[PDB]
Amino acid sequence: LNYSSRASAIPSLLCDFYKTSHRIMYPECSQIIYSTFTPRSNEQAPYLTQVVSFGFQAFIIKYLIHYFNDNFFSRDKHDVVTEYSAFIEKTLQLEDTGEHIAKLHELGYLPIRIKAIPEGKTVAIKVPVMTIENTHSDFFWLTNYLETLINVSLWQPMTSASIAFAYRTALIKFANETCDNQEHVPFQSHDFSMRGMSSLESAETSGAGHLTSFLGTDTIPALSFVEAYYGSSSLIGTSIPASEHSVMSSHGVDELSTFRYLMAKFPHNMLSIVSDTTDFWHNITVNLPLLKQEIIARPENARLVIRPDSGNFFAIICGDPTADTEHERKGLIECLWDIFGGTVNQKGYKVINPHIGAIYGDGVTYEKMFKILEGLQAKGFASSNIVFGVGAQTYQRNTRDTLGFALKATSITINGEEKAIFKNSQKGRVKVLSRDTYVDGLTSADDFSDDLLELLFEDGKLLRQTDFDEIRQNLLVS
Amino acid sequence: LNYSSRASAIPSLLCDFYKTSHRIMYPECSQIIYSTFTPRSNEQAPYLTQVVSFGFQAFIIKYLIHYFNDNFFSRDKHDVVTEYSAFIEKTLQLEDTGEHIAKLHELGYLPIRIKAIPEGKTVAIKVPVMTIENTHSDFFWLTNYLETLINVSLWQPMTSASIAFAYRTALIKFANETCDNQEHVPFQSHDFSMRGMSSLESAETSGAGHLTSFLGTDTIPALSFVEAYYGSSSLIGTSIPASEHSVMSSHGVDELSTFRYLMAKFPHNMLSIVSDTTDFWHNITVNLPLLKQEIIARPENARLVIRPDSGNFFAIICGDPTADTEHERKGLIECLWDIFGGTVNQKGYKVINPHIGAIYGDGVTYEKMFKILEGLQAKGFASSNIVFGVGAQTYQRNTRDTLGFALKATSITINGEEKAIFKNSQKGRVKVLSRDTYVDGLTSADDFSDDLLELLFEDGKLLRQTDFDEIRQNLLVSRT
Ligand SMILES: NC(=O)c1ccc[n+]([C@@H]2O[C@H](COP(=O)(O)O)[C@@H](O)[C@H]2O)c1
Numbered sequence: 011l012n013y014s015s016r017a018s019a020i021p022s023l024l025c026d027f028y029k030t031s032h033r034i035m036y037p038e039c040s041q042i043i044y045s046t047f048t049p050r051s052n053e054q055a056p057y058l059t060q061v062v063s064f065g066f067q068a069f070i071i072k073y074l075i076h077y078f079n080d081n082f083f084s085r086d087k088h089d090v091v092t093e094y095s096a097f098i099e100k101t102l103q104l105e106d107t108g109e110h111i112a113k114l115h116e117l118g119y120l121p122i123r124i125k126a127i128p129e130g131k132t133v134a135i136k137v138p139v140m141t142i143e144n145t146h147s148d149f150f151w152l153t154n155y156l157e158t159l160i161n162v163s164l165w166q167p168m169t170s171a172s173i174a175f176a177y178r179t180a181l182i183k184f185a186n187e188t189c190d191n192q193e194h195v196p197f198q199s200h201d202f203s204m205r206g207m208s209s210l211e212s213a214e215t216s217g218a219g220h221l222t223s224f225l226g227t228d229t230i231p232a233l234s235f236v237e238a239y240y241g242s243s244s245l246i247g248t249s250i251p252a253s254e255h256s257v258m259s260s261h262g263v264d265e266l267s268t269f270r271y272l273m274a275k276f277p278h279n280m281l282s283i284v285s286d287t288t289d290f291w292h293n294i295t296v297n298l299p300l301l302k303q304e305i306i307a308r309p310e311n312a313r314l315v316i317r318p319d320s321g322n323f324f325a326i327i328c329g330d331p332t333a334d335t336e337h338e339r340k341g342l343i344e345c346l347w348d349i350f351g352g353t354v355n356q357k358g359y360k361v362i363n364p365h366i367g368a369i370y371g372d373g374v375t376y377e378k379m380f381k382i383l384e385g386l387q388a389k390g391f392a393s394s395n396i397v398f399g400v401g402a403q404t405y406q407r408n409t410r411d412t413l414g415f416a417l418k419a420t421s422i423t424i425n426g427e428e429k430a431i432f433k434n435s436q437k438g439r440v441k442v443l444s445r446d447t448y449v450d451g452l453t454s455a456d457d458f459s460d461d462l463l464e465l466l467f468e469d470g471k472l473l474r475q476t477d478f479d480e481i482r483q484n485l486l487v488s
Numbered sequence: 489l490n491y492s493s494r495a496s497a498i499p500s501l502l503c504d505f506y507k508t509s510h511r512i513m514y515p516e517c518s519q520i521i522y523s524t525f526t527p528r529s530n531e532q533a534p535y536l537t538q539v540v541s542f543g544f545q546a547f548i549i550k551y552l553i554h555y556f557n558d559n560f561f562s563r564d565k566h567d568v569v570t571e572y573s574a575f576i577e578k579t580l581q582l583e584d585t586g587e588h589i590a591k592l593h594e595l596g597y598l599p600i601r602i603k604a605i606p607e608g609k610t611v612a613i614k615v616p617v618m619t620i621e622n623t624h625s626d627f628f629w630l631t632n633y634l635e636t637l638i639n640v641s642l643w644q645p646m647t648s649a650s651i652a653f654a655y656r657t658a659l660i661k662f663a664n665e666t667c668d669n670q671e672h673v674p675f676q677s678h679d680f681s682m683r684g685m686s687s688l689e690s691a692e693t694s695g696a697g698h699l700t701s702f703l704g705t706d707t708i709p710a711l712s713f714v715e716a717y718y719g720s721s722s723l724i725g726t727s728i729p730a731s732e733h734s735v736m737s738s739h740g741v742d743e744l745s746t747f748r749y750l751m752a753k754f755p756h757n758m759l760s761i762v763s764d765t766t767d768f769w770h771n772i773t774v775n776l777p778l779l780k781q782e783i784i785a786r787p788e789n790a791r792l793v794i795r796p797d798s799g800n801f802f803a804i805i806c807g808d809p810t811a812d813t814e815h816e817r818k819g820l821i822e823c824l825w826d827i828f829g830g831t832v833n834q835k836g837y838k839v840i841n842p843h844i845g846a847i848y849g850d851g852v853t854y855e856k857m858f859k860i861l862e863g864l865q866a867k868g869f870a871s872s873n874i875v876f877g878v879g880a881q882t883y884q885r886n887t888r889d890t891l892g893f894a895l896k897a898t899s900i901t902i903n904g905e906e907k908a909i910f911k912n913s914q915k916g917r918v919k920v921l922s923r924d925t926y927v928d929g930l931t932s933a934d935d936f937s938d939d940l941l942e943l944l945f946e947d948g949k950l951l952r953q954t955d956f957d958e959i960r961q962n963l964l965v966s967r968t
């Protein structure tokens with residue numbers, strides 16, 4: 011973490027505005043507020059049956075430790091309190107001395123206790139993934155206050171990780187039906203989403219979620235994000251040289267020459283060449299046969315990969331039986347089988363010559379991925395014959411309501427006595443008993459041994475840390 | 489300003505991975521790459537007929553100036569190289585000496601010129617809003633190298649600004665028929681989206697976009713972002729104290745006492761009270777009548793605002809003719825009219841007693857906003873009778889495909905000869921003549937004299953600066 015970005019967010023005003031008004035609205039003698047973070051529904055995305063825990067450690071380190079230490083506890087105090095009071099004065103014409111902020115500063119740490127599902131473990135929809143409460147009686151308001159920051163930063167990484175897991179589940183099922191092994195699966199979903207994410211910070215946490223199930227990515231800052239907040243012994247992620255449309259068109263319309271030029275620039279690496287700049291099917295039916303000898307001479311670890319980027323997703327890959335030309339009635343995959351070799355595997359499915367490959371990365375979604383694999387299976391082609399560039403239409407096109415994430419207060423302690431709070435509904439303290447069952451009737455005095463929610467952060471300290479190997483291992487056993 | 493976040497993103501690697509491979513793929517003697525940033529389509533949101541220029545200045549200062557100066561040009565050259573090369577050698581399995589990174593470092597600035605439409609002006613769909621090219625021939629690769637960073641950071645602020653502009657158009661248009669004036673309009677869309685955005689950084693830029701057309705927000709970090717990157721002479725945005733469900737339930741089931749308690753805590757402020765924690769219609773039909781004298785005794789600038797947060801959006805506000813009850817057929821606004829006073833304005837529409845108000849903020853979208861105002865207009869209620877809490881289903885539920893934002897290379901110079909790129913919209917260099925017309929097929933030799941695209945950044949320097957007052961005034965003039 012040896013770089014820094016300049017920031018504007020005020021540590022004591024990093025919230026929905028109305029949170030600044032709640033402190034004096036709570037009953038007198040309020041002491042503790044306890045809240046839960048739960049994915050409440052997959053109605054908007056029934057294919058996500060499983061929530062991957064991911065992002066907590068990075069969020070704790072980036073914000074609850076470093077941001078508050080760098081920008082609040084490290085800072086003067088008179089300056090920090092004055093900034094807070096002046097903002098309340100301007101916006102409400104209330105005179106809030108900021109004494110609660112001064113007291114927080116004097117403490118020197120966040121009096122907060124957090125438990126969470128270990129990252130890489132999985133939970134059913136509606137099972138809580140994290141709980142938060144304050145540990146000092148003067149700071150009941152702090153649990154309230156932090157709600158906005160917690161879910162603005164955590165629902166995206168868990169949603170992307172859960173999406174990637176559901177992709178991986180489907181890829182494994184097609185591999186079990188149609189392939190002799192699943193060695194291709196870690197590379198079969200390749201994150202393309204970076205430019206289509208809404209900010210660099212969202213690209214980092216989303217792309218990190220993708221990497222919990224997959225190795226392939228172009229989102230470089232996601233790799234370095236994982237390296238900084240998790241670390242790893244094994245390779246975090248990988249990618250390959252690949253051309254873009256501006257490269258192809260800058261060489262003019264003779265794409266046969268361009269292919270030869272690009273393959274000569276990268277003789278010892280896999281190389282993706284986007285193939286639809288001028289005439290996609292001309293490249294397939296004319297240029298690939300002319301290039302065949304050169305292609306099959308390359309080392310197998312340096313295979314040429316064909317990238318279409320236009321057309322109907324299903325027709326381009328699987329063929330369109332209504333089409334006017336033979337090459338279009340078959341898809342890219344069958345055409346590559348026709349031009350290059352292949353074998354028939356033990357399951358009875360066609361596996362194209364490994365000197366050629368195909369990646370499809372135009373608006374890929376789970377549903378489109380699934381339909382393509384079904385179409386190839388129906389034609390007797392193994393699911394390993396294609397890679398998916400999985401982009402912003404998968405990872406950006408979500409909301410907090412995709413998995414129904416909500417942080418809700420479930421218990422308040424007033425004048426020494428714990429009370430359930432709810433709208434009419436989790437009530438009281440919770441304990442996760444298994445991946446699919448929890449119990450909520452609880453008080454702080456109850457047992458809590460073997461809780462799937464494990465203590466993570468307390469009073470300024472990250473008490474439990476993981477690396478990205480453990481996360482991936484957890485997700486393997488899942 | 490004066491705070492800092494720790495960062496991991498390597499400046500010389502702030503791109504899609506495959507951009508590191510493009511430099512040697514371009515033709516020999518490549519010298520200049522010219523690219524345009526265009527919102528290409530709005531069928532996914534046809535109500536967005538005007539794209540608001542917004543976000544460039546903050547993007548230039550944050551990333552092209554401070555991030556690269558703080559984290560690249562300031563740093564030891566050998567360390568910055570080496571970090572890049574080691575990364576390429578492991579990730580990707582190839583040897584890149586990083587000489588080009590060293591040369592960029594030695595130059596000391598990004599050899600880039602950017603022109604952009606001034607922020608707060610608007611253009612039609614398919615009109616370019618920004619152009620970028622390199623200024624030194626060794627750095628032909630840098631223009632598209634920056635593509636990933638340019639739109640990961642810019643499509644959201646302009647989409648949010650364009651959405652807010654479209655909301656304001658509709659709200660103004662209902663005001664012209666149902667109200668005597670538009671004094672409520674700046675407050676009628678209040679940003680509720682912060683918790684539903686995908687990161688703090690996205691919340692800041694989206695919420696700054698909302699603020700270009702509206703004053704009301706709860707996204708405090710958007711205020712501080714605008715304050716940091718733009719500034720204004722007066723208060724950037726406004727909000728009000730408001731309860732949430734946990735405060736209501738923490739006081740128990742007697743919500744009558746709670747309402748009265750909260751009102752005493754904010755005696756001289758507008759105050760939103762969320763009203764559906766236990767029994768929404770009980771609060772409306774029983775407790776508000778009991779509270780009436782109390783309510784009207786307050787200063788008018790301290791009106792009580794009722795917030796429903798559940799039920800069908802249209803039925804709760806406008807009423808549902810399918811029934812069982814008086815009150816559910818009438819809806820909230822008409823119920824408030826029955827309980828409290830009102831007047832009939834010059835256009836013939838009912839205006840509720842100004843001591844009571846209503847805010848609806850549960851999954852609001854442009855279409856839901858429009859239908860509610862149609863429902864109120866049909867019942868003869870002025871559109872000023874409702875405030876909208878406009879949240880994540882408006883500002884988070886978008887993609888780069890909402891307005892079709894794309895950067896594309898449209899002109900390349902190779903060995904002194906500039907050629908238009910013709911991939912199969914735009915070809916060659918571009919000039920914006922008016923809000924809805926541009927001309928392309930140009931070269932660097934042509935006359936850019938009447939260009940709506942204004943020179944903005946060159947070779948490390950912000951050449952033109954704006955503040956938020958100018959943006960908002962520009963948007964007034966755009967309207968218009
Ligand atoms: N290595 C690559 O080929 C690569 C990487 C990222 C995006 N892309 C392309 O960029 C386009 C837009 O992608 P997204 O909007 O999903 O980010 C797509 O056409 C995608 O194929 C390609």
Ligand SMILES: NC(=O)c1ccc[n+]([C@@H]2O[C@H](COP(=O)(O)O)[C@@H](O)[C@H]2O)c1
Pocket residue numbers: 026028410679680681682683684685706730731760795797849850851877878879880881
């Ligand atoms: N000042 C307020 O009353 C306020 C502010 C922000 C969000 N909210 C509520 O938070 C919930 C979620 O909002 P979003 O998911 O759109 O961000 C909604 O019920 C919203 O009404 C209320």
